């Protein structure tokens, strides 16, 4: 019956594609298996884990802060395949590698895994529960730190939740098995990220609160984002609870130079540690990176090789390979380095389908400020409002927009916001002076009037007047934080909810994952009584089913596994339904469903 | 009747296509052409040199605070991302815009590499046409090539006098700037071209090729005395200014910021460092050699940067924007450049690789980047796609074997044959250099330890020597020193009978590099013409049904060509095809190759 | 430019096909181009005898000729029996002059009427007229027959006198000696006019008697030998010449042919001729039980249209006949050498055969003339019941006796027809369709002839149905003495407006039969020119890419014509086509139709 189920899931997927993969580039047809690399033997030296269950949160960040050594923290398993495959990367290709990380790089500081747009993703669209995936990682490296990213007062969603939301979400996220929140504000709102940052302390959890970097800080003829911005606002989240200061450099933006200034004056500014997040868009990022190890911060954060570059992080193997022998040698093995590499390309090709078109740097970044993030899933969203040939008009909208908004930082999710704004002026052939005008109807993006109106917090110079008077056509706008207009939440009366929709208890997890996406989670939680549990199944097979006479090996479980053989298909019959002819283990299986051509 | 010929052209690769293109990607069919930005144009490096001369030119790039950038992507840029495919309709369509937009730059590199040989080879088109064109557009920039030294432009040393005679007329073509290197690093066999160079009264600039790493005490043949000690002798060899080629991107930050403020320690030239991008740190390392006073970089145009092609100019530019060694170039025309260079790029779909990013592994292959990609589908040929990480380790092994060496081309292409021969025939290197095991070599491998690309420092392993000739006697001299000088007066008579017409001294110098890729490529331009004024889409793919084509034959006449129809195979053989040119009907008579 | 207007269609038709042809199935690809047969080296035939003689005294002739008079019907019923009438001009005429030279004894061509008129216009875009001048020019020795509906003419209701009187006037001077005049229900006041029209033009009128039933059969006395032997008589008093038994469907068995024929021949002096279907299979034995008993006349069909719903095997009833005191005396090797072409001119009409097999005796069940059946086989396709084709023959034989057992022929058939089809369709009997509580919504064909229009038959109509087909009250008077007489010189000045021409009295002749069909004929000849002129393949398909074709656009004026290649469609809608006309190129646009 679980069975049942995942025969019916690669039938379906089988006799009609998935509608993710279908009209989309294939892998090669030979494909290498993804192998796990055979570790040699040695057991697992504890690591940060062990030391933060030891010292908690506090004294974990003054160890951090005193170590010689810079830390890394890898994001392959997050920001890596989100910034490269549409965050597609799947919990079967994640957690088959999480004990190779355990034995082979014990001194990483953490393995970046979970939240930004992985928790949406992998229900919408991977048909996987993203707690699922977080235990299966803790299992798997029970000596390293998990890290989550957590959007402030926008959890792992789009938009502002009531704060009994927000501390709920963390709650389940720390029982969950997150150790490292980092967790940011879209337009630098110390006033809108406390109450995360305290829901983090109170799980007694490692709050690494963020400053978005913008701009840049050694061009004067843009001071509102100087040096005194960043160790202000380091100074304040200090203030505010933090363990440890993240600079979070979402579009890659900051500059050699500017990383050797910044540094040196933040860890002057805070006793915290900080924490380097970067993007390689520019091509220059690892110099970025270097910089800042040559400054003094902490730890930095890079990507496995073969998921680094362009939109994604630098490459791990080659810092580490620049930092070799030099004082703050982070230590870890580069053969083994290479390894996982080399697992990652096997896995990553399997993903062809959501390969984009980047073809490598592009210093038109310092000009857009796309986050990386958000640069692909932008660039189609153009291709699907017939602009394909205008990108580049695109981008300058973008930048148009930015400075119409009165210079914001854009991460999610003001980027959204922004991007809503460069692409209705593109398409509508429009100049900001013309949105702005006064003789102009314009019909702006919801999500325009709703940042415009105080949705998404205040950036520190207000909104500007002229453009929020036309935006709102009479709405009054707030400038209060937006979590304390949101009725709370009655989560006794939702839990009711969702459990007669879906006649069975719930657990805390899965009220957390409806309390963010509650029709995601329901289509979720609907798709897997029809499927089981297809995060089982290998990635082939999970986005293409079964060719003719294919032998698959699949394990529900961890006695049992199904050797399943599609031996033939029919033509399909007058109901509309296709039959598959399995074999599940030597015995016969017929598998009907429907022709959704 | 040169319209003809073209017809000819434009009826046969429609009909067939073009070989280098029939089984590999298509660009996308809607295709945005690449448009020439709208824009006197500044004295610049060109004026000066002219004044100063070269000697006195490299002292004025010493003294200059800012650092000077070389442009990459008219070669070593798609080179090392498409396989030298990039054509002159593409490349001299940008030169004028270069010239107005960027009038600070040091030069452009646009020639010499693989270019030579693939323009005639793959393209149907003349490298001094290219060469001359570009220096139409560009009159106030440098012109920079690649020499590789004994070998010209060709996989092998030369007579000295094909290697004077080819440097005569490189000169003479437009090169400003020769970078010049020796394929081991070996000093004696720079000399003859050096000195070539010299007499011309151009820039030689002269390479040491890095390779290992200087900060790693366990490899201590590439020491930093060996980096210093080779300017010194270059400088004593005439040199006008040194250059750093890291052919594979090998030299880490750390390492940079000592070896440059050595290089200036020890010789008073100035100093051009150009490097790859295979590791995803090449910015690093070039923005810690500005910082250590180093004259002049190079880096490619963004949308042709990165990977295996050198690392990101408008970014490097942008990180020294400000700064005290600010380049002083306008990021916004960067990016206009850019942006056409890509549009120019989609064009050549057909020859991406599948390279996805950055990779670490360089530092244990030291495989050079304008290599890479052609050895990993050298593999494929050989069937080996599913071992590719066995073959780098064999590279890595092969250059052990044979001694340590410098890999760049054309020693690099000897230690790819002698590593794929390994995977294939399961070897290792004990068996490799042992006595009961009967193992024939590639002829490369045979001819380089004969000593035909000379000799590395400490000379060949003797035991992989006695082995690999099957008996016969290796040289240590120069392999030019034995080599006759060939008869030039004699080697024209023979290209001239094989084409029953005169030939310039352009074209004979091209005979003496290529024989038979000038032959060959000679016959097809009187056969199909002056196929290099078509544009991209229209050489590779032809004209679609309907289509319409403005072709410049001269600059005068602009002919405007129509594909109006095509017939189905005659029993002749024969498919004829429809045009319009200048509104008057033509039929052209084509060759069904199906 | 007629010869631009020819380029015109065939591109159009090679582009698009033909609607005729489009989705219908085709002949072979290698196809024979059918040949003329040489005739050895014109002996004068009847033409000269009725030129000389006149009708009166001709009929006489044939009367008193022992010998069986042959008439050739593979130009008319022929084709129109067995290919739908799509029979063109081109296939036509050029055989004419061989039958002229090959077989002179011959009584008659049957080559006009009928549906060819029709037909000629609406589906083959060719004139009638130029179709009869052409067969005249190559037959002036033997007499051209036609068939006439009577009252109806050409056409499928009866018309104005005055119109009759006309259109037999222009047959004439047109070029028919023969015609076969019939009524659809044998009543004679109704073919007065006719008759007296072919009379004052000093023409043969053959008025037909239409055969139904079976006078051997006691059960069915309605149609007994009296009904046949007072026709004749009636008719010969109505000024006949010569007296006709046409059997349409087929059904005049060989016993009835001897009682038959033997009894005409004592009522009547006037000589006799026989027309007969052979759908039973077995219509050569009536034929010759005919012989045998002294008719004068008989019909056959080459054999290579002869057979089923076509006449009987004109090449084997001459076989049977050779050597007795009858024979024909026609050159049996020449019949062979004509039916060879007529098989080679057939297979280029593949889309318009049927499916038909063979011999059927249920035409004695169902009386569907031989003309018919095809028609009302496509027609029962058309309507969704190829499945229940059986039960459809039972309706049209239950109809036939609920009108009161009447004779089956155009245009009466064509109305039994669709009250089959009807009855069908609609699961109704007999019964239901005449029940007084039962809504019926007759067809258009159905209401008309229990009206009136087509005429009387001897009994009336059956008072019950003609009460709820009709409210209207019916008219047993002569129908064209209700029918006003039309001003010709008016409704010429309508025609010639449309056209904007002066149109000839032939063409005006068209116009009074078939207004419209007549008037897109003529905008369509206006587009597309003589496209009679062109051979058949190329008619219906246009020309393959490369294939050369030869037309005569006058007798003295042959163009060359060649296919060189066929554009894809353009963003107007149009595709143009490359023609090569006598060596020099044309481009030739059409709308992709598609
Ligand atoms: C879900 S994914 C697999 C299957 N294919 C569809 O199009 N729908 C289901
Ligand atoms: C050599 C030329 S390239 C165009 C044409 N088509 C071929 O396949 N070969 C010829
Ligand atoms: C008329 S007949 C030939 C041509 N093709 C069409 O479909 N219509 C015209
Ligand atoms: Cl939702
Ligand atoms: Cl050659
Ligand atoms: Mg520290
Ligand atoms: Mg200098
Ligand atoms: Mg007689
Ligand atoms: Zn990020
Ligand atoms: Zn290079
Ligand atoms: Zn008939």
Not at 86 to 93: L, V, W
Not at 180 to 196: K, P
Not at 304 to 315: E, F, I, K, V
Not at 451 to 471: I, R, T, V, Y
Request: glycine share 8%.
């Amino acid at each position: 019956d679980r069975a049942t189920k995942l025969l019916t899931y690669l039938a379906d997927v089988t006799v009609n594609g998935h509608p993710e993969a279908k009209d989309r580039p294939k892998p090669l047809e030979n494909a290498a298996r993804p192998v796990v690399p055979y570790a040699n033997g040695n057991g697992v030296k504890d690591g940060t884990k062990q030391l933060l269950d030891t010292l908690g949160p506090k004294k974990f960040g003054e160890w951090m802060r005193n170590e010689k050594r810079v830390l890394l923290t890898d994001t392959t398993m997050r920001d890596g395949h989100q910034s490269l495959l549409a965050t597609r990367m799947r919990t079967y290709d994640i957690a088959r590698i999480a004990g190779t990380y355990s034995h082979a790089l014990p001194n990483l500081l953490s393995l970046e895994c979970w939240g930004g747009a992985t928790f949406d993703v992998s229900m919408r669209f991977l048909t996987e529960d993203p707690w699922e995936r977080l235990a299966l990682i803790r299992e798997g490296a029970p000596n390293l730190l998990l890290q989550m990213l957590l959007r402030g007062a926008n959890g792992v969603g789009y938009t502002n939740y009531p704060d009994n939301v927000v501390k709920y979400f963390v709650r389940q996220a720390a029982k969950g098995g997150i150790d490292l929140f980092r967790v940011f504000d879209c337009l630098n709102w110390v006033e809108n990220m406390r109450v995360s940052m305290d829901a983090i302390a109170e799980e007694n959890k490692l709050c690494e609160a963020a400053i978005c970097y913008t701009g840049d800080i050694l061009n004067s003829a843009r001071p509102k984002y100087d040096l005194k911005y960043y160790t202000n606002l380091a100074v304040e989240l200090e203030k505010a609870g933090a363990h440890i200061i993240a600079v979070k450099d979402m579009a890659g933006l900051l500059k050699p130079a500017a990383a050797k200034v910044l540094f040196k004056a933040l860890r002057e500014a805070t006793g915290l540690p900080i924490h380097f997040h970067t993007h390689d868009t520019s091509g220059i990022a690892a110099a970025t990176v270097l910089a800042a190890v040559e400054a003094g911060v902490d730890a930095v954060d890079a990507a496995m090789d073969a998921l680094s570059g362009n939109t994604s992080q630098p490459c791990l193997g080659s810092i580490v390979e620049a930092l070799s022998g030099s004082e703050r040698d982070p230590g870890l093995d580069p053969a083994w380095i290479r390894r996982i590499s080399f697992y990652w390309e096997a896995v990553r090709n399997q993903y062809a389908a959501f390969e984009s078109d980047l073809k490598g740097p592009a210093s038109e970044v310092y000009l857009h400020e796309m986050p990386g993030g958000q640069f692909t899933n932008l660039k189609e969203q153009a291709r699907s409002l017939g602009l394909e040939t205008r990108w580049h008009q695109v981008a300058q909208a973008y930048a148009d927009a930015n400075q119409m908004f009165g210079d914001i930082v854009k991460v999610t999710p003001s980027s959204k916001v922004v991007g809503d704004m460069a692409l209705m002026m593109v398409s509508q052939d429009l100049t900001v002076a013309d949105v702005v005008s006064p003789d102009r109807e314009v019909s702006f993006p919801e999500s325009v009037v709703s940042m415009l109106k105080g949705d998404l917090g205040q950036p520190p110079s207000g909104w500007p007047e002229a453009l929020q008077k036309k935006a709102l056509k009479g709405e009054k706008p707030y400038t209060v934080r937006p979590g304390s207009l949101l009725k709370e939440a009655d989560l006794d009366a939702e839990r009711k909810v969702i459990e007669k929709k879906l006649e069975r208890e719930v657990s805390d997890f899965e009220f957390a994952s409806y309390l963010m996406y509650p029709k995601v989670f329901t289509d979720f939680a609907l798709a897997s009584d029809t499927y089981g549990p297809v995060s089982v199944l290998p990635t082939p097979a999970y986005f293409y089913g079964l060719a003719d006479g294919e032998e698959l090996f699949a394990d529900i479980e961890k006695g049992k596994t199904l050797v399943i053989v599609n031996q033939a298909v029919s033509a399909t019959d007058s109901q509309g339904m296709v039959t598959v002819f399995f074999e599940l283990n030597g015995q016969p299986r017929r598998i009907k469903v429907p022709d959704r051509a």
